[PDB]
Protein backbone atom coordinates (compact mmCIF):
# COMPACT_ATOMS: atom_id res chain seq x y z
CA UNK A 1 0.00 0.00 0.00
CA UNK A 2 1.03 3.61 -0.59
CA UNK A 3 2.71 5.19 2.43
CA UNK A 4 0.29 7.97 3.43
CA UNK A 5 -0.58 10.01 6.51
CA UNK A 6 -3.33 8.93 8.90
CA UNK A 7 -5.33 10.75 11.55
CA UNK A 8 -4.16 9.05 14.74
CA UNK A 9 -7.54 9.65 16.41
CA UNK A 10 -9.72 7.99 13.75
CA UNK A 11 -7.33 6.18 11.38
CA UNK A 12 -8.61 7.94 8.27
CA UNK A 13 -6.22 8.99 5.52
CA UNK A 14 -5.46 12.70 5.52
CA UNK A 15 -6.38 14.24 2.17
CA UNK A 16 -5.36 17.54 0.59
CA UNK A 17 -6.52 19.05 -2.70
CA UNK A 18 -5.45 22.03 -4.77
CA UNK A 19 -7.47 25.16 -5.49
CA UNK A 20 -8.17 24.02 -9.06
CA UNK A 21 -10.02 20.99 -7.67
CA UNK A 22 -11.72 22.64 -4.68
CA UNK A 23 -12.99 25.44 -6.91
CA UNK A 24 -14.27 22.90 -9.43
CA UNK A 25 -16.10 21.03 -6.66
CA UNK A 26 -17.62 24.29 -5.41
CA UNK A 27 -18.79 25.21 -8.92
CA UNK A 28 -20.21 21.70 -9.40
CA UNK A 29 -22.24 22.07 -6.21
CA UNK A 30 -23.29 25.56 -7.30
CA UNK A 31 -24.57 24.25 -10.64
CA UNK A 32 -26.38 21.38 -8.93
CA UNK A 33 -28.15 23.71 -6.51
CA UNK A 34 -28.86 26.26 -9.25
CA UNK A 35 -30.52 23.90 -11.73
CA UNK A 36 -32.34 21.69 -9.20
CA UNK A 37 -33.09 23.28 -5.81
CA UNK A 38 -35.69 20.63 -4.94
CA UNK A 39 -33.12 17.83 -5.26
CA UNK A 40 -30.54 19.90 -3.37
CA UNK A 41 -32.87 20.80 -0.49
CA UNK A 42 -32.15 17.71 1.68
CA UNK A 43 -28.39 18.16 1.21
CA UNK A 44 -28.43 21.97 1.29
CA UNK A 45 -27.33 22.46 4.90
CA UNK A 46 -24.27 20.21 4.65
CA UNK A 47 -23.25 21.74 1.31
CA UNK A 48 -23.52 25.27 2.70
CA UNK A 49 -21.46 24.41 5.76
CA UNK A 50 -18.82 22.56 3.71
CA UNK A 51 -18.36 25.49 1.33
CA UNK A 52 -18.46 28.09 4.10
CA UNK A 53 -15.58 26.17 5.63
CA UNK A 54 -13.54 26.94 2.51
CA UNK A 55 -14.77 30.54 2.51
CA UNK A 56 -13.53 31.02 6.08
CA UNK A 57 -9.94 29.98 5.39
CA UNK A 58 -7.35 32.25 3.79
CA UNK A 59 -5.13 31.10 0.93
CA UNK A 60 -2.33 33.44 2.06
CA UNK A 61 -1.38 35.03 5.37
CA UNK A 62 -1.76 38.44 3.67
CA UNK A 63 -5.15 39.22 5.19
CA UNK A 64 -4.34 42.94 4.88
CA UNK A 65 -4.46 42.72 1.08
CA UNK A 66 -7.57 41.40 -0.64
CA UNK A 67 -7.10 37.90 -2.04
CA UNK A 68 -7.05 38.86 -5.72
CA UNK A 69 -5.42 35.63 -6.92
CA UNK A 70 -7.43 34.38 -9.93
CA UNK A 71 -7.94 30.92 -8.44
CA UNK A 72 -8.71 31.87 -4.83
CA UNK A 73 -10.93 29.03 -3.63
CA UNK A 74 -12.08 31.34 -0.82
CA UNK A 75 -13.47 33.80 -3.36
CA UNK A 76 -15.16 30.95 -5.22
CA UNK A 77 -16.75 29.84 -1.95
CA UNK A 78 -17.93 33.38 -1.23
CA UNK A 79 -19.49 33.57 -4.68
CA UNK A 80 -21.18 30.22 -4.06
CA UNK A 81 -22.67 31.42 -0.78
CA UNK A 82 -23.79 34.73 -2.30
CA UNK A 83 -25.46 33.12 -5.31
CA UNK A 84 -27.10 30.35 -3.27
CA UNK A 85 -28.60 32.71 -0.72
CA UNK A 86 -29.67 35.17 -3.40
CA UNK A 87 -31.43 32.43 -5.37
CA UNK A 88 -33.08 30.59 -2.48
CA UNK A 89 -34.03 33.69 -0.47
CA UNK A 90 -37.55 33.86 -2.01
CA UNK A 91 -37.94 30.18 -1.08
CA UNK A 92 -37.60 30.91 2.64
CA UNK A 93 -34.05 29.63 3.02
CA UNK A 94 -33.36 32.07 5.85
CA UNK A 95 -36.06 31.05 8.39
CA UNK A 96 -35.39 27.41 7.52
CA UNK A 97 -31.64 27.85 7.99
CA UNK A 98 -31.90 29.77 11.25
CA UNK A 99 -34.38 27.29 12.71
CA UNK A 100 -32.18 24.28 11.94
CA UNK A 101 -29.28 23.35 14.19
CA UNK A 102 -25.95 24.20 12.55
CA UNK A 103 -23.06 21.86 13.34
CA UNK A 104 -20.39 24.23 12.04
CA UNK A 105 -20.24 26.93 14.70
CA UNK A 106 -18.54 29.33 12.28
CA UNK A 107 -20.96 29.08 9.36
CA UNK A 108 -23.13 31.99 10.53
CA UNK A 109 -20.07 34.23 10.80
CA UNK A 110 -18.86 33.24 7.33
CA UNK A 111 -22.33 33.83 5.90
CA UNK A 112 -22.48 37.26 7.53
CA UNK A 113 -19.04 38.24 6.24
CA UNK A 114 -19.43 36.85 2.72
CA UNK A 115 -22.81 38.59 2.36
CA UNK A 116 -21.64 41.79 4.07
CA UNK A 117 -20.50 43.60 0.92
CA UNK A 118 -23.14 41.96 -1.29
CA UNK A 119 -25.20 44.62 -3.02
CA UNK A 120 -28.10 42.44 -4.16
CA UNK A 121 -28.63 40.84 -0.73
CA UNK A 122 -26.55 42.43 2.00
CA UNK A 123 -26.02 40.72 5.34
CA UNK A 124 -28.15 43.47 6.88
CA UNK A 125 -30.71 42.91 4.13
CA UNK A 126 -30.43 39.16 4.73
CA UNK A 127 -31.23 39.78 8.39
CA UNK A 128 -34.21 41.93 7.40
CA UNK A 129 -35.49 39.17 5.10
CA UNK A 130 -35.02 36.59 7.85
CA UNK A 131 -37.07 38.76 10.19
CA UNK A 132 -39.76 39.31 7.57
CA UNK A 133 -39.98 35.58 6.89
CA UNK A 134 -40.22 34.76 10.59
CA UNK A 135 -42.85 37.44 11.16
CA UNK A 136 -45.03 36.68 8.13
CA UNK A 137 -45.07 32.98 9.03
CA UNK A 138 -48.48 31.78 10.18
CA UNK A 139 -47.02 29.91 13.18
CA UNK A 140 -43.68 30.78 14.75
CA UNK A 141 -41.32 27.87 15.47
CA UNK A 142 -42.22 25.84 18.54
CA UNK A 143 -40.62 26.35 21.94
CA UNK A 144 -37.79 23.95 21.22
CA UNK A 145 -37.04 25.32 17.76
CA UNK A 146 -37.43 28.96 18.80
CA UNK A 147 -34.44 28.68 21.14
CA UNK A 148 -32.25 27.49 18.27
CA UNK A 149 -33.67 30.25 16.08
CA UNK A 150 -32.81 32.89 18.69
CA UNK A 151 -29.31 31.50 19.19
CA UNK A 152 -28.66 31.48 15.44
CA UNK A 153 -30.02 35.02 15.09
CA UNK A 154 -27.78 36.21 17.93
CA UNK A 155 -24.72 34.54 16.40
CA UNK A 156 -25.55 36.21 13.09
CA UNK A 157 -25.84 39.51 14.99
CA UNK A 158 -22.38 39.10 16.51
CA UNK A 159 -20.85 39.12 13.02
CA UNK A 160 -22.97 41.94 11.64
CA UNK A 161 -21.69 45.52 11.21
CA UNK A 162 -24.22 46.77 13.73
CA UNK A 163 -22.52 50.19 13.83
CA UNK A 164 -22.84 50.72 10.07
CA UNK A 165 -25.41 53.34 9.03
CA UNK A 166 -27.84 52.04 6.41
CA UNK A 167 -31.36 52.58 5.13
CA UNK A 168 -32.64 49.55 7.04
CA UNK A 169 -32.47 50.31 10.77
CA UNK A 170 -35.80 52.16 10.66
CA UNK A 171 -37.12 48.94 9.06
CA UNK A 172 -35.27 46.29 11.06
CA UNK A 173 -36.43 48.04 14.23
CA UNK A 174 -40.10 47.68 13.26
CA UNK A 175 -39.55 44.10 12.11
CA UNK A 176 -37.97 43.29 15.48
CA UNK A 177 -40.75 45.03 17.39
CA UNK A 178 -43.38 42.92 15.65
CA UNK A 179 -41.22 39.79 15.99
CA UNK A 180 -40.69 40.34 19.73
CA UNK A 181 -44.41 40.92 20.24
CA UNK A 182 -44.92 37.19 19.60
CA UNK A 183 -42.10 35.65 21.65
CA UNK A 184 -43.80 35.53 25.11
CA UNK A 185 -46.56 33.38 23.60
CA UNK A 186 -44.01 31.08 21.91
CA UNK A 187 -40.91 30.57 24.04
CA UNK A 188 -40.78 27.81 26.67
CA UNK A 189 -41.04 28.70 30.34
CA UNK A 190 -38.01 27.40 32.24
CA UNK A 191 -35.37 27.33 29.48
CA UNK A 192 -32.39 29.67 29.45
CA UNK A 193 -32.83 32.34 26.77
CA UNK A 194 -29.78 34.59 27.04
CA UNK A 195 -29.79 34.64 23.23
CA UNK A 196 -32.63 37.16 23.35
CA UNK A 197 -30.52 39.36 25.63
CA UNK A 198 -27.61 39.06 23.19
CA UNK A 199 -29.94 40.11 20.36
CA UNK A 200 -31.10 43.12 22.39
CA UNK A 201 -27.50 44.09 23.15
CA UNK A 202 -26.60 43.90 19.47
CA UNK A 203 -29.67 45.93 18.51
CA UNK A 204 -28.89 48.69 21.00
CA UNK A 205 -25.60 49.34 19.16
CA UNK A 206 -27.07 50.58 15.87
CA UNK A 207 -25.95 54.11 14.90
CA UNK A 208 -29.57 55.24 14.58
CA UNK A 209 -30.55 57.69 17.31
CA UNK A 210 -34.26 56.91 16.90
CA UNK A 211 -34.68 53.23 15.97
CA UNK A 212 -33.60 51.93 19.37
CA UNK A 213 -35.66 54.73 20.92
CA UNK A 214 -38.83 53.08 19.61
CA UNK A 215 -37.51 49.53 20.02
CA UNK A 216 -36.93 50.09 23.75
CA UNK A 217 -40.50 49.32 24.82
CA UNK A 218 -40.93 45.78 23.39
CA UNK A 219 -37.44 45.27 24.80
CA UNK A 220 -38.84 46.15 28.22
CA UNK A 221 -41.83 43.81 27.86
CA UNK A 222 -39.73 40.89 26.60
CA UNK A 223 -37.22 41.49 29.41
CA UNK A 224 -40.09 41.45 31.90
CA UNK A 225 -41.19 38.10 30.48
CA UNK A 226 -37.63 36.76 30.59
Amino acid sequence: TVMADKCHDCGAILEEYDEETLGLAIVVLSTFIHLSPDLAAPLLLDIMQSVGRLASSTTFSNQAESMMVPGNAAGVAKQFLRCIFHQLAPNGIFPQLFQSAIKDGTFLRTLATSLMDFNELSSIAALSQLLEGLNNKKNLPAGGAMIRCLENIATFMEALPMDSPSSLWTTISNQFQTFFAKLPCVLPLKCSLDSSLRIMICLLKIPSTNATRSLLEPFSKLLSFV
Binding site: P37, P42, P95
Partner: peptide
Protein backbone atom coordinates in the same frame (compact mmCIF):
# COMPACT_ATOMS: atom_id res chain seq x y z
CA UNK B 1 -44.00 29.69 -5.04
CA UNK B 2 -42.17 26.61 -3.76
CA UNK B 3 -41.23 27.12 -0.12
CA UNK B 4 -38.67 25.44 2.10
CA UNK B 5 -40.15 23.18 4.76
CA UNK B 6 -38.67 20.96 7.45
CA UNK B 7 -39.91 17.44 6.79
CA UNK B 8 -41.00 14.82 9.33
CA UNK B 9 -37.49 13.35 9.33
CA UNK B 10 -36.21 16.84 10.16
CA UNK B 11 -34.60 17.49 6.78
CA UNK B 12 -35.28 20.33 4.39
CA UNK B 13 -37.49 20.05 1.33
CA UNK B 14 -39.08 22.34 -1.26
CA UNK B 15 -42.87 22.10 -1.16
CA UNK B 16 -45.25 24.58 -2.76
CA UNK B 17 -66.60 15.92 -7.68
CA UNK B 18 -63.52 15.21 -9.80
CA UNK B 19 -65.73 14.74 -12.85
CA UNK B 20 -67.49 17.96 -11.90
CA UNK B 21 -64.08 19.65 -12.04
CA UNK B 22 -63.82 18.58 -15.68
CA UNK B 23 -67.42 19.66 -16.29
CA UNK B 24 -66.84 23.16 -14.92
CA UNK B 25 -63.43 23.56 -16.56
CA UNK B 26 -64.74 22.32 -19.92
CA UNK B 27 -65.30 25.15 -22.39
CA UNK B 28 -68.49 23.41 -23.54
CA UNK B 29 -70.00 24.28 -20.16
CA UNK B 30 -69.07 27.95 -20.64
Amino acid sequence: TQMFHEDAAGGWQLVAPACLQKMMRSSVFH
